[PDB]
Amino acid sequence: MTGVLTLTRTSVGKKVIMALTGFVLVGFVVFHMYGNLKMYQGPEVYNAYAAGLRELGYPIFGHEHLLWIARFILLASVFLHIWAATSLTLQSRRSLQASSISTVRRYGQHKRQSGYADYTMRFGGVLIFFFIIYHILHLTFGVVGYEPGQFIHPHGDVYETYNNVVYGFQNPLIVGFYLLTMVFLALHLYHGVWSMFQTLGWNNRTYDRLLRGLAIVVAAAVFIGNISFPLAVYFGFVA
Amino acid sequence: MTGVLTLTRTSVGKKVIMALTGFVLVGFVVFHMYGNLKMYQGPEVYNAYAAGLRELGYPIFGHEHLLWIARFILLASVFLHIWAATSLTLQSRRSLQASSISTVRRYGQHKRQSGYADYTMRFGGVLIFFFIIYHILHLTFGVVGYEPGQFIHPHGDVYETYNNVVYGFQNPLIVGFYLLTMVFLALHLYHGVWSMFQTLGWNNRTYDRLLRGLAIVVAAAVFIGNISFPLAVYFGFVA
Amino acid sequence: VYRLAQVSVNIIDQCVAQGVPFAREYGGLLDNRSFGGAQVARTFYARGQTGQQLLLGAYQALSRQIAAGTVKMFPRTEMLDLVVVDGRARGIITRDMVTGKITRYAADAVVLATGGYGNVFYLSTNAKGCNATAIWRAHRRGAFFGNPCFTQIHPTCIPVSGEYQSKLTLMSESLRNDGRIWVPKKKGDTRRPQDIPESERDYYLEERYPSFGNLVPRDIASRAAKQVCDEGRGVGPGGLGVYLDFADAIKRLGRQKIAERYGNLFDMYKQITGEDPYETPMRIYPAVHYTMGGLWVDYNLQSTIPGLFVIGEANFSDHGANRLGASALMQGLADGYFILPYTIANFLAQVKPGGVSIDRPEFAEAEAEINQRIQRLLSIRGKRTVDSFHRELGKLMWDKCGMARNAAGLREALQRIPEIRAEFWENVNVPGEANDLNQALEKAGRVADFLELAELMCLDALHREESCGGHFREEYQTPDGEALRNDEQFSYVAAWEFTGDLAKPRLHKEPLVFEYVKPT
Amino acid sequence: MKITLKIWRQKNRNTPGEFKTYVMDNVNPDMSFLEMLDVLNEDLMSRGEEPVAFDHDCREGICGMCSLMINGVAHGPKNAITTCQLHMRSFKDGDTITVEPWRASAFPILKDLVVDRSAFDRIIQAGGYISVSTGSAPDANTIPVSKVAADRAMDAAACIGCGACVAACPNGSAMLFTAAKVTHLALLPQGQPERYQRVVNMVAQADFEGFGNCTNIGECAAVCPKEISLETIAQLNRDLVMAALRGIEPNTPIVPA
Amino acid sequence: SVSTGSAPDANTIPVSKVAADRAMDAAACIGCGACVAACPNGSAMLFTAAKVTHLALLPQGQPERYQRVVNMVAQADFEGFGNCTNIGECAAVCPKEISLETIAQLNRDLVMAALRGIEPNTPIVPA
Ligand SMILES: Cc1cc2nc3c(=O)[nH]c(=O)nc-3n(C[C@H](O)[C@H](O)[C@H](O)COP(=O)(O)OP(=O)(O)OC[C@H]3O[C@@H](n4cnc5c(N)ncnc54)[C@H](O)[C@@H]3O)c2cc1C
Ligand code: HEM
Ligand code: HEM
């Protein structure tokens, strides 16, 4: 009747929406890690990349046009992801609340043969939401975790993202929080890359191991790339 | 049960692999001819194009990243082409040795009524392999067919490919070898452009003549451009 | 029989159309196989679970009807009595086994599909919950029992592992094709079965009945196995069972083909027994599988009591004295689909709807009787358990009224039965309360019904002075060992009428006349 | 073989339950777990205590009546078997064995180890069938079915409805059962005309019955007695996506009587 | 793979006239082997393609087409025949004028059979 909106009605439709959003978010995360890998080249290359992010197709497209479209798409995707994850978690909690030996335990001696994704995915998602809020409030705006007169706002057409990065990862608490979030995000990707393919139905006997290996390698690469930066900045390798 | 790897077991799968690889290689050859057509505009335009080939996505992507990806794809495709072509040629040769009247010929006489692709494709392929192994070593590296102090390696972000081209096609033997290779490649394309479409199964009553005409025009354009380059370089039209 | 054979084709078509995954050939059409001795390949099968697929299709149809609201389903409840009003079966009295509530239901017609009564013996291939309460109550109310002594056995079954198990897994009959049934010559041997030399093995069924070719009928082989096990030459942990060796078959044939033909059976045996059949010999012991007897019905599938229809395994139906393989499911589906609707529509059209509610005195009397019986059973609180009485009754029935029946043994069993019934009614112990999930009460009721029914079935076995089908009498056998019929005197169906005395049931004879297939 | 057991005991649906410890000295290694429980119940009856109640009909792993969580893994430590098929030769002398029923909101507890599984019946009633009538069937060999499709449908259809997938899944979801039924009915031509509706209805019924969502953990297929693989879930997901593309609206839920 | 006596009614499955005509065109192969001798590679591609096209254009051949072609193709590779260069002598020499499109059809089927993970069976060893 309504059409696509029918996915809102059932749990499997919510999972499909979550899988599409996870596709988009995984693509964005991989692209962001690849872009942030350029900070090893030097301040000039990193600043040029940051400036050119705002000038995609400058002769054709206007200033900060594609970037704003990407920002809006990411915001909508993350909002849908949060809503679907909260709804499914509440549904599962209600499904397990009635028959449990205790308010904190369901079975007396349950042993899971498979993974513990139910815990890792949820806790990593909550931590990722909090870290995304802190990161947006920390590096893009520069109004937290910064000594006064250290964060340089983008003036005109020049950018000082290299200086902001080098002055950001100085507090040990900040780098520890970043490392913990990166570990949780690594686990989240390691599960979700295969989970989204399974949810959409693009899985068979032949491609299961291939998809699992792709998830493993993507998660490992993302984790290594994301944890290289804070340690390098804190230890003075990048200055 | 492996999946796509089943294509390696049968001859038809090898032909399909060859068709895909030939599609990629034909695209690359057409793009390369179109790019090399710029040398008529002058040394500045040719040098700018050569420099910009490396800086494909410089504002976003890294230096030589896309070029290296294309190089790897081309190398893998050409290796698969060589392997499959050699295997198919050996298998077809083994199918005639048992009953041929002589080691040189099958029948006393045999009036072919449809074409001579069996000789043309194989001989042109081996000549193209030798020409590629010489070309990469001649123009990209400049360590053969060059007087000392003539080839200028790319130093920094400046390229002298126009000078290397104008100093390369000077030996009459080199230009004759290039012309013979281009003739053989013209025949190779004239057959293979339609052959790959037939192999992949995209053919019927309606599209056969259109595919033949497309193959004819593609081969003619490639041949014309790739023989106009070295002849004009040698005759002094481009200096 | 002709009606069943005629409607079998529609049975198969309806089963196929419902989505039953029957075995298919490579071209897309159905596949058929022979049923281990039949001269034609007329059997449609799933891989190993044809009955499961057929029941799943029927249950899917029933669920579709339930969703439409036409059919109301009551799981976890059992019928305890039948209410007859003005000579017509007009209701039932049931007990909800979860809460213990007693409910009265009234309807224009009552249909019984409660299955066979093969669980009267303690050891059988039937399910744990199979019983004969409903059919016995119907017979007590006035229904006639047709040939209760006709029971079918199965040759290959897993023997028991002690005095605690009452379920015997049904092996396929595809085994024993190599013969090789043997028992060690020494009564007690501690050596491994494969360590016994071939010359030291008392290979019975080979030196005895040699003309058949070690492929004797299941009746003779099962009787010989029971005789060997009763003599004290058993091989199982409890002294019950016989050895079926496959070493000679493995050596003669190729292991790959034997595996491809017996893999599921070998895996299930290794899961249950714990021994690989490839190396160690199998242990088998025949057990009772089917009951051809049941309530007598006419051409309209209607019992003696008007308004009461008996279908499925609960009636005598048309299986005679021996049920052919892959026929019980066909008969049940025929009765359910293409037979019962017509007769029930005719009967309902001959009468008018309604007129009877659950406030009638008959319903109250039946409910009071059920409540008093339950209270008495719960208040006996003796010493012996229900399982002990059931095991004693089953052992007595299997020893006397089993595969080999003689006048002296049947008379001894008939004398013994009332003492066992009195001991059960005086010294049984069931715990719990009536209004709870008490399985012991249900088991006690089923045991009481079995005790009542065993006397009648033994009386019927004694009355029939001939050997035919499953019912075998030692005094009327051919010298070869087969069964000898007496068509001049016993060519009829014996229906037993409950006269109120469990030892004096009236006998009615329904003559059988054959016009197309002559006896031979 | 001396065995100590910790059995969950509950008087009724609303009465709270607790674990009870029973030690038995002589246990035959070759006898099954259910026979061991029967022996324990007989001993309790002889002593005078209330026997332990559990579900058991076939003792062959076909009916699906058995439902027991042993040592935290459904249907005992061994896989691809049911509770009735588990024997005592798979355990060790002196081991402690924990017995308890399924735990789910949709599976109310009625006794010590007996649970209600009518939610599966209600799920089946919500379109999980083929709406054909009696007597209207065409000839059996009318519609050809490929052997591969028939084999896959038979593999998916061999579900005993034990409910172990619900009790093993950390979310307590019935995704494996619904996926198996949908895959069985959608791989045959006879189920083609109404598959896209059917799955949606079934899925909605699950969401109405109180089952959780699916996180693709995979614990369900690890303890499934009949080895229903995870491709059924992928098939169900594909069918649901295709139905949503077609604008299929779920019907009203099946309200229990 | 249809056994004798299990056939349904003739008019049960309708077949379009165009499909029937194409199947008849592909099926009219006398098995002379002229395509093998005329082909410079000495390949039996036209014969296999004609058989596959004839058996794949009818509904009765649908349930087992994707396996069938692979098996047939494998058997050809096992028998010693060459590969197909798409030259075209087979059609120009074939007595019954079987078009080259059958080969394309075969190719398509094989590609599809490659996508679904179909593996060829054991080759047919001559007695
Ligand atoms: C291991 C085994 C293998 C078999 N193989 C074959 C074979 O290959 N071919 C063949 O033809 N036959 C075979 N049979 C026999 C066949 O299964 C039965 O004979 C037949 O299915 C019985 O039909 P039914 O309708 O009575 O079903 P049943 O299941 O026997 O009917 C019993 C039903 O009635 C209910 N019920 C019973 N008592 C009560 C009560 N008091 N109150 C309420 N409900 C009650 C039960 O809950 C159940 O739903 C086999 C049997 C077994 C045990
Ligand atoms: C761990 C290493 C990371 C580094 C070094 C890093 C670095 C940066 C920097 C410097 C900015 C500000 C750019 C600017 O102001 O011009 C930024 C913005 C951003 N980062 Fe990150 N980031 C990291 C991880 C992540 C991750 C894991 C995510 C995704 C969850 C993410 C999402 C974003 C977003 C959404 C923005 C805002 C983009 C915009 O406003 O255009 N970052 N990042
Ligand atoms: C860095 C950004 C994120 C990415 C790339 C990401 C990616 C994914 C992917 C690919 C999946 C698998 C979806 C599927 O099974 O089909 C997933 C599942 C999930 N994500 Fe995220 N996620 C991100 C952030 C979050 C956030 C912010 C939350 C919530 C706070 C969250 C909570 C979850 C939950 C709960 C699930 C699983 C729910 C279920 O399976 O039922 N994630 N994620």
Ligand code: HEM
């Ligand atoms: C300039 C690069 C090349 C291009 C663009 C190219 C393109 C093609 C194409 C499109 C085909 C038709 C494939 C089909 O029938 O499906 C083909 C066939 C063939 N090529 Fe190449 N090719 C190239 C280089 C080579 C090389 C280096 C060799 C071997 C030394 C070679 C040997 C062959 C052979 C033997 C065939 C025919 C195989 C058969 O028909 O069974 N080619 N080529």
Ligand code: HEM
């Ligand atoms: C016929 C006239 C041709 C001319 C004048 C020509 C000229 C050149 C030049 C100047 C380069 C160096 C590009 C650079 O350094 O950025 C080059 C590279 C190359 N040419 Fe050619 N070429 C010709 C034909 C061909 C043909 C027919 C092929 C393949 C069939 C080919 C394959 C290549 C490849 C693979 C490279 C390496 C590109 C790279 O490393 O990025 N060329 N050619």
Ligand SMILES: CCCCCCCCCCCCO[C@@H]1O[C@H](CO)[C@@H](O[C@H]2O[C@H](CO)[C@@H](O)[C@H](O)[C@H]2O)[C@H](O)[C@H]1O
């Ligand atoms: C990388 C560029 C340089 C390439 C260098 C090597 C070129 C030559 C490679 C070896 C040539 C022979 O290649 C080999 O051919 C045989 C048969 O001919 C193929 O063999 C396979 O296909 C044939 C027919 O298609 C089947 O009959 C056979 O059973 C199967 O194994 C092998 O899969 C391939 O490895």
Ligand code: SF4
């Ligand atoms: S899917 Fe497996 S675990 Fe779930 S009910 Fe069916 S048989 Fe049991």
Ligand code: SF4
């Ligand atoms: S030439 Fe034509 S008719 Fe002869 S075998 Fe080949 S395909 Fe058949």
Ligand code: F3S
């Ligand atoms: S455990 Fe749950 S996540 Fe899926 S595989 Fe089973 S329904």
Ligand code: F3S
């Ligand atoms: S001409 Fe020869 S190469 Fe193949 S397509 Fe025909 S048999």
Ligand code: FES
């Ligand atoms: S008794 Fe049937 S599965 Fe256990």
